[PDB]
Amino acid sequence: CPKRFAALFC
Amino acid sequence: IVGGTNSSWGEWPWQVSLQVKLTAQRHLCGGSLIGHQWVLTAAHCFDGLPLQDVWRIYSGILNLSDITKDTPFSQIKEIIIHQNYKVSEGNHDIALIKLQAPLNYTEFQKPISLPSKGDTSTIYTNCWVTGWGFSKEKGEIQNILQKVNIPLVTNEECQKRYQDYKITQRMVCAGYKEGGKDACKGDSGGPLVCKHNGMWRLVGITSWGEGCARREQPGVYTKVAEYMDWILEKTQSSD
Numbered sequence: 001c002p003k004r005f006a007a008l009f010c
Numbered sequence: 011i012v013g014g015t016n017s018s019w020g021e022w023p024w025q026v027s028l029q030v031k032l033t034a035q036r037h038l039c040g041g042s043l044i045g046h047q048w049v050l051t052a053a054h055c056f057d058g059l060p061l062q063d064v065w066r067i068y069s070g071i072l073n074l075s076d077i078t079k080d081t082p083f084s085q086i087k088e089i090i091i092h093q094n095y096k097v098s099e100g101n102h103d104i105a106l107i108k109l110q111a112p113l114n115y116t117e118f119q120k121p122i123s124l125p126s127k128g129d130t131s132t133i134y135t136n137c138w139v140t141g142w143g144f145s146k147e148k149g150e151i152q153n154i155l156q157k158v159n160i161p162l163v164t165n166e167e168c169q170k171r172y173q174d175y176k177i178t179q180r181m182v183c184a185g186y187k188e189g190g191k192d193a194c195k196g197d198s199g200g201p202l203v204c205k206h207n208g209m210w211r212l213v214g215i216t217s218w219g220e221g222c223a224r225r226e227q228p229g230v231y232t233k234v235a236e237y238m239d240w241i242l243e244k245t246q247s248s249d
């Protein structure tokens with residue numbers, strides 16, 4: 001998942 | 011949550027912590043209890059493993075450091091990710107989790123109310139975002155559930171700040187022009203709730219934004235009203 005998403009490993 | 015404050019017991023009884031245990035245990039995402047066996051969260055919380063034996067879902071917990079070996083938790087029975095979610099794109103960032111057992115409702119463990127399939131928010135003047143995510147960019151998970159009051163912003167104004175994407179009618183934005191208050195890493199999948207006439211209800215699911223709490227970069231949330239047909243269909247069908 002891209003940088004703009006908030007999961008820790010995005 | 012950036013620029014927020016510590017919550018007290020019973021303020022946000024729908025908030026859950028979605029954690030994984032492999033060899034170590036960690037908080038990954040937020041979620042909202044919406045029924046006795048159903049949690050609503052973000053689809054992107056599952057990029058990485060959707061093999062659901064790893065998950066531990068904590069409800070009725072205000073302070074995470076309070077969690078021990080003996081703290082009860084829910085396990086996952088079923089994961090329903092929106093069929094049109096594609097990780098690269100980011101549209102339809104919404105997922106349902108069916109718990110292995112129904113939960114008894116208490117003052118600290120109750121479902122959030124859902125909107126109807128077609129509303130506008132202009133009555134939503136009092137909105138809050140909660141979670142255990144970072145309190146700053148390049149921060150760390152917070153122990154006590156944080157709350158922050160943030161204004162909704164029109165999709166037109168949101169679109170101006172994000173020329174690279176994509177702000178659809180199925181998203182809702184919230185934030186301050188000057189920044190300093192916002193969701194952040196670890197807050198994914200958690201609730202954006204608004205209080206109207208003394209009742210709370212779920213307006214958004216924490217999704218994406220540029221960094222955290224930057225000026226003129228509002229948070230983007232999945233607009234729950236636009237998925238209510240989907241939520242009803244999937245939960246009724248599964249039940």
Ligand SMILES: N=C(N)N1CCCCC1
Nearest residue numbers: 005006193218219222229
């Ligand atoms: N609201 C912001 N800034 N977010 C949403 C949650 C993922 C990290 C970025």
